[PDB]
Amino acid sequence: VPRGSKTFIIGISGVTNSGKTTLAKNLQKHLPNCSVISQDDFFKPESEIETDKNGFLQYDVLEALNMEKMMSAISCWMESARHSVVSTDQEEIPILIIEGFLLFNYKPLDTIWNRSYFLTIPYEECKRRRSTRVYQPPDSPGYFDGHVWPMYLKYRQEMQDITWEVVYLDGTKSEEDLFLQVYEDLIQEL
Ligand SMILES: NC(=O)c1csc([C@@H]2O[C@H](CO)[C@@H](O)[C@H]2O)n1
Numbered sequence: 001v002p003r004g005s006k007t008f009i010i011g012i013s014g015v016t017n018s019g020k021t022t023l024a025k026n027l028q029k030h031l032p033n034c035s036v037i038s039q040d041d042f043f044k045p046e047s048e049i050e051t052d053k054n055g056f057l058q059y060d061v062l063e064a065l066n067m068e069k070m071m072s073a074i075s076c077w078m079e080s081a082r083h084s085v086v087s088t089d090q091e092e093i094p095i096l097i098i099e100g101f102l103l104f105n106y107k108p109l110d111t112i113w114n115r116s117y118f119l120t121i122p123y124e125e126c127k128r129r130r131s132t133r134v135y136q137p138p139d140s141p142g143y144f145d146g147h148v149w150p151m152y153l154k155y156r157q158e159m160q161d162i163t164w165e166v167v168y169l170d171g172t173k174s175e176e177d178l179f180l181q182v183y184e185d186l187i188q189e190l
């Protein structure tokens with residue numbers, strides 16, 4: 001059976017400010033032939049972002065994201081992955097980590113995940129962390145309570161009846177703690 005077509009695809013989702021990109025990067029440092037795609041690279045331009053009744057910009061929903069372009073990026077990785085291991089005797093399986101706040105309610109990718117991790121942090125600490133970061137445009141006062149958190153709760157309710165298993169993680173753990181936990185799980189799946 002010809003080699004070169006197999007891949008191992010990891011999803012890392014979770015609430016805003018939970019250390020998803022950092023975890024992706026720490027995993028990539030310790031995994032061979034591993035790439036990372038970030039969902040935050042695929043937001044539509046502000047002119048395509050809608051507002052709600054209260055005039056909050058609707059960023060924390062799939063309609064804010066060019067998910068067709070994200071799929072194209074994934075497909076580009078897959079094509080590269082097929083050429084990433086030179087042919088010889090008889091497998092070294094290329095790894096992709098896809099990380100983002102809103103991955104597990106996107107139905108076209110429901111069968112892509114070979115492993116799925118989901119970073120959780122409770123309301124108060126999440127709110128605190130969110131306030132330490134600067135966004136473009138900057139968070140309006142009341143944005144977290146008015147949009148970010150309600151939309152997270154909607155996502156979590158969208159995930160209550162999902163068709164694959166997700167490993168939920170405590171995002172208040174240190175970066176190294178999270179890395180070791182995930183690595184420990186992942187290396188048994190590879
Ligand atoms: N324009 C943007 O990229 C943007 C504006 S707000 C924002 C936040 O990004 C988070 C996901 O990483 C999500 O909670 C958005 O409110 N992104």
Ligand SMILES: [Cl-]
Nearest residue numbers: 085086087088
């Ligand atoms: Cl070859």
